[PDB]
Structure formats: C-alpha cells, structure tokens
C-alpha cells in the first residue's frame, strides 16, 4: 500500500 503522502 502507498504512504499517506504519495499525493
């Protein structure tokens, strides 16, 4: 799963 800040 991706980190919270991959935005």
């Amino acid at each position: 799963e991706l980190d919270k800040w991959a935005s």
């Epitope: 799963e1 991706l2 980190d3 919270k4 800040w5 991959a6």
Partner: antibody, heavy 123, light 108 residues
Framework: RITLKESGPPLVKPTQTLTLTCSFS??????????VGWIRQPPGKALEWLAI???????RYSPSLNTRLTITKDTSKNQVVLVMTRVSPVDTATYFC???????????????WGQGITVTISS | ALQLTQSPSSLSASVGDRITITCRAS??????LAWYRQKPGSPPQLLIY???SLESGVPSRFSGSGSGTEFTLTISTLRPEDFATYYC?????????FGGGTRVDVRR
C-alpha cells in the same frame, strides 16, 4: 525546537507486554499531517521500522509484528504510546520514537529523533 | 515488502576522502528516501530528506541524488565525525523500510 523522549521499563520478562511512551515538545499531534514513529535497533544491528501514528489518527504497523503492536496517542499529554506483546530476547534493543513533518515535500524523512531507550528482555 | 539494499555495507576511508554510498529499492519509491548518520551511542540524525534536499543545519559536504530505485549519498570531504554508520529509509510505501546500513570507519 522539537524534542522527543522515550520512557518505559528497561527490563522486561519474556512473554510479557512492553509499554513505551514517547513524550515530545515543540509540536503537537494536532498540527496537520504530523506523525510520530517508532524505530528499534538491536545491539550492533540495523534500524528496524515498527510503527507510526498521525495527527488524524491513522496508524500503520510493521507487517511482521502487527498482531503484537498497538500504537496510541493522548493529545492532552502530548505523548504517543507503543505496546508490544509477548516479547522475547530477540526484542532486546534500543527503541526510538521520532517526528515526521506534515505537508506545509520534506515529509519524506523522520527529521527529529528521541535519544532512544534501551530495553533488555530477560527472565 | 520493499527491499532496500545498501552498499557497500562496510567501507574504509580517511579524513579528506570523497566517498559515495548507495541505497537501492526493489520497487520505485519516487523521491521519498531519507539519509541518516548514526554515531555509536547516539540516535540517527537526518542529513537528506526527499532524496536530494539537504536538511537544515546539515553540513554542505553532504549531498544526495537519485529517484525511483537508485539513490546515493556523497560526502565531499570526510571528517572525523563522519566515521559512523549511515542508513537510508523510504517513506513511499508502508511499511517504511530502512536499509541495512553503511559502515564508515578509519582506514589504516
């Protein structure tokens, strides 16, 4: 600025529960996006990621530990707590809690660390 | 999960030396990679955040570059306080992985 300090028992018996507390100042868990993580390091070994909790409360644990870890935060105390169950000698290490910046780019790192608390597991 | 391989794992050098160490990931982590220096008995200390940004307060001799699966940390001129162990960490995927570390000691 920001400083953090780990506290808890230096000695824990195999099987028991290890409760760790991270007290910090210079930031609060209500600032947007801010996180606090836990990193451990066995004697003479590499750093190992344990878990992280954020301002809005989501948290993540290391897959290979997650049925043994519980991370929480009390915001009036400005502390984060980590509970590790059924510890064994292999859990003997130095435990660090660290701060992670929230979006104002540079959220890509744990910028300030505690000094660490070394915990030894023995009966 | 994501494997971060640091190399060389051990390195021997002298004050005034220029060294470059690497950390590479099994999957692309974009620019979410940080570098730390850890001296015996002390906690890790942030040098580089977001792969190439020098952390405020960190000496200019330290620099980082890379993106995706390849990253490097370079020390333009080795100082006494640099003989320590260096670690990289990616914060793009959970769990946040640390490399195995790079050990820099004094050459003789």
């Amino acid at each position: 600025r920001i400083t953090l300090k780990e506290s808890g028992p230096p000695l824990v018996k195999p099987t028991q529960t290890l409760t760790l507390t991270c007290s910090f100042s210079g930031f609060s868990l209500s600032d947007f996006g801010v996180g606090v993580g836990w990193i451990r390091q066995p004697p003479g070994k590499a750093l190992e990621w344990l878990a992280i909790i954020y301002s809005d409360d989501d948290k993540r644990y290391s897959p290979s530990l997650n049925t043994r870890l519980t991370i929480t935060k009390d915001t009036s105390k400005n502390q984060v707590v980590l509970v590790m169950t059924r510890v064994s000698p292999v859990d003997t290490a130095t435990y660090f809690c660290a701060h992670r910046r929230g979006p104002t780019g540079p959220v890509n790192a744990m910028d300030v660390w505690g000094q660490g608390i070394t915990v030894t597991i023995s009966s | 999960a994501l494997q971060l391989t640091q190399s060389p794992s051990s390195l021997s050098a002298s004050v005034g030396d220029r060294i470059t160490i690497t950390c590479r990931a099994s999957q692309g982590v974009t620019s979410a990679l940080a570098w730390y220096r850890q001296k015996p008995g002390s906690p890790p200390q942030l040098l580089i955040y977001d792969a190439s940004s020098l952390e405020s307060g960190v000496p200019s001799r330290f620099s980082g570059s890379g993106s995706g699966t390849e990253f490097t940390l370079t020390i333009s001129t080795l100082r006494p306080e640099d003989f320590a162990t260096y670690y990289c960490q990616q914060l793009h995927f959970y769990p946040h992985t640390f490399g195995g570390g790079t050990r820099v000691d004094v050459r003789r």
